[PDB]
Amino acid sequence: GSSGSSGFLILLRKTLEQLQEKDTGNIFSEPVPLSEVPDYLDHIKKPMDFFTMKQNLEAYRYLNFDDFEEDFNLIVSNCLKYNAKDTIFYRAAVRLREQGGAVLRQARRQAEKMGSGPSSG
């Protein structure tokens, strides 16, 4: 595989590899096995995973940091929509929401520094 035809596009390659270091259980690293959950598509309206993130990125689908951030939030939320309030998988999605929530902040500022516009709040 190959990609990164613009300096903004290169940020997303290295950032996706930093979100992959926030899943130490490999729960989101791969797609949910339908062979043990055949009803997943009847309960989840927009299913996603880290392989689909990578494939979309290698297919030039992400031209703004907002969509790359929002599809990570979608992957977190799709766990929380199909689990019980006491499982490993539930708390693994809470772990991504916190730890990789920082990864999207530290990496957005590499685009904002060259996108220009206003500052502070």
């Binding site: 959950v37 309960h43 199909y82 019980a84 499982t87 998988f89 539930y90």
Partner: peptide, 10 residues
């Protein structure tokens, strides 16, 4: 019985 990953509660 059941603890996530099968669409069942109550």
């Amino acid at each position: 019985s059941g603890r996530g990953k099968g669409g069942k509660g109550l």
